[PDB]
Paper text:
2C-methyl-D-erythritol-2,4-cyclodiphosphate synthase (IspF) catalyzes the conversion of 4-diphosphocytidyl-2C-methyl-D-erythritol-2-phosphate to 2C-methyl-D-erythritol-2,4-cyclodiphosphate and cytidine monophosphate in production of isoprenoid-precursors via the methylerythritol phosphate biosynthetic pathway. IspF represents a potential target for development of broad-spectrum antimicrobial drugs since it is proven or inferred as essential in these pathogens and absent from mammals. In all IspF crystal structures three subunits form a compact bell-shaped assembly approximately 45 Å by 60 Å in the axial and equatorial dimensions respectively. The enzyme active site is located in a cleft at the interface of two subunits and here Zn2+ is coordinated by the side chains of two histidines and an aspartate.
Numbering used by the authors:
A (entry chain A), B (entry chain C), C (entry chain B): 1 to 161
């Protein structure tokens, strides 16, 4: 088994006037993430971990502002597209694990929805997808609720068939 | 062989009047970590990584306030119970690696004691457990000594036989 | 296959009067990283991830500023020495992935040069080395351009022959 590791990072500012969408789940909340389209910090981090494991670069290098195929793409579309490219490069996905750091709101009741979304987008059963939530103990911009961070890890095997 | 990756994160505030306990090792110091029980930032991060690798959620999901069987539990008990559940889920542990970010004090003389505690609670030989230490170059709440961070990574195998 | 995971972290201050050297690549910029020698945040993070995976401790414990054999060693010499120690411990490197978090300058056109330096230094083909770049969305010291962080992950196999 030619096994490979990938890691990903993302962060977005939390601001008034926007919906909170994490792992494709809309979480009712006074504020939301700032960025293009749905600003899905968790989906972006996983997308980068998968591209990383496959030595395919990063989410920026694959998905430009001018790319014709992804005009009006949101984060789930990019995640499905990433999955396709990783497959096409000759890899299979062992599993994904992740952590979202948000001081608030509480994410635990929404985690299973995030798992179902990610598993579908990756062609994985639920048992190979995991998402964990953590506060930042009121430390830093994350602790102050100025932002939300996601960390991801992915393991692939290059077939190798 | 069905290999799986997990990653974990923890952080605690560093305050007056608490002992500093990291990797189960009490380290002489004028401040210590805040949180329930012993606030062992490093064991918590390793625990989350193991649960993540097993797709079992996170520490918070497993170890609540109201569980009869774990009041009185400190971080080593939780790490041992985590190991038991990972084994009960059908997995074996390949190894763990980690980093503790603290501007001070020096952790290097205490690292081997941390490794031995962790290997014992996970039933691993020392040679499969690693702990590393970093400062934060005087940047951020970590660099100012307002908290301590731990990062961890675990690799399991779903047996598989 | 006796597979093992490693993870690494580094951060350095960004200051006037220093070159910006990341992954062995000099990137013209008004500011550069503070630290001994070249202060190569990326190469240090990768070095730690590899020592971690082999359970050989960390970069600081291996490379003393007192060691005769490495005074005047820059970060590429350290990464090469690291690779050599990991080999003698009986390990082979599957792959390395990483992220550099810098608000600026743009790193994308320099990434392939970094990958080439890393692949050379580790004895790997380019296909097993990845480097990704992220801003910090103007958050925190990273966001304000006061430093640069690197994250790494490495996968080893203990021979196992
Ligand atoms: N310093 C930086 C930061 C980001 N980038 C590129 O910009 C893309 C978008 O990054 P952000 O999401 O941080 O805005 C990244 O995925 C990477 O391709 C870069 O090339 N240099
Ligand atoms: N809907 C989206 C979301 C993100 N992206 C690209 O994904 C990369 C990372 O996303 P963020 O900068 O929003 O974290 C960016 O380069 C952005 O251009 C995109 O092209 N379309
Ligand atoms: N935003 C957050 C942060 C934490 N949590 C849950 O709270 C539990 C403990 O979080 P902390 O260690 O950050 O206090 C986490 O393990 C997670 O289960 C959550 O559901 N939503
Ligand atoms: N002694 C302890 C320490 C932690 N825990 C659980 O571990 C979770 C994560 O730990 P921290 O919040 O202290 O990082 C907490 O939400 C708490 O429920 C516990 O139940 N008993
Ligand atoms: N709190 C700390 C921070 C660093 N260290 C040691 O110092 C060495 C260099 O650390 P820095 O690069 O963060 O300065 C580390 O690799 C580790 O060996 C330590 O033992 N305790
Ligand atoms: N040129 C260099 C760069 C780093 N090092 C060692 O590498 C470790 C990590 O480097 P930094 O503290 O500069 O991130 C330190 O212990 C430093 O002593 C070295 O000995 N020679
Ligand atoms: Zn994003
Ligand atoms: Zn904790
Ligand atoms: Zn460094």
């Amino acid at each position: 088994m030619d096994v490979r590791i990938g890691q990903g990072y993302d962060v977005h500012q939390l601001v008034e006037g926007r919906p909170l969408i994490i792992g494709g789940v809309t979480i009712p909340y006074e504020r939301g993430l700032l960025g293009h389209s749905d600003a899905d910090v968790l989906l972006h981090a996983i997308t980068d971990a998968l591209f990383g494991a496959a030595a395919l670069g990063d989410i920026g290098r694959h998905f430009s502002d001018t790319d014709a195929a992804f005009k009006g793409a949101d984060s789930r579309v990019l995640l499905r597209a990433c999955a396709e490219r990783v497959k096409a490069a000759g890899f299979t996905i062992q599993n994904v694990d992740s952590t979202v750091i948000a001081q608030a709101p509480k994410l635990a009741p929404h985690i299973d929805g995030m798992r179902a979304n990610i598993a579908a987008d990756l062609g994985l059963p639920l048992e190979r997808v995991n998402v964990k939530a953590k506060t930042n103990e009121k430390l830093g911009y994350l602790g102050r609720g100025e932002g939300i961070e996601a960390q991801a890890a992915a393991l692939l095997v290059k077939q190798g068939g």
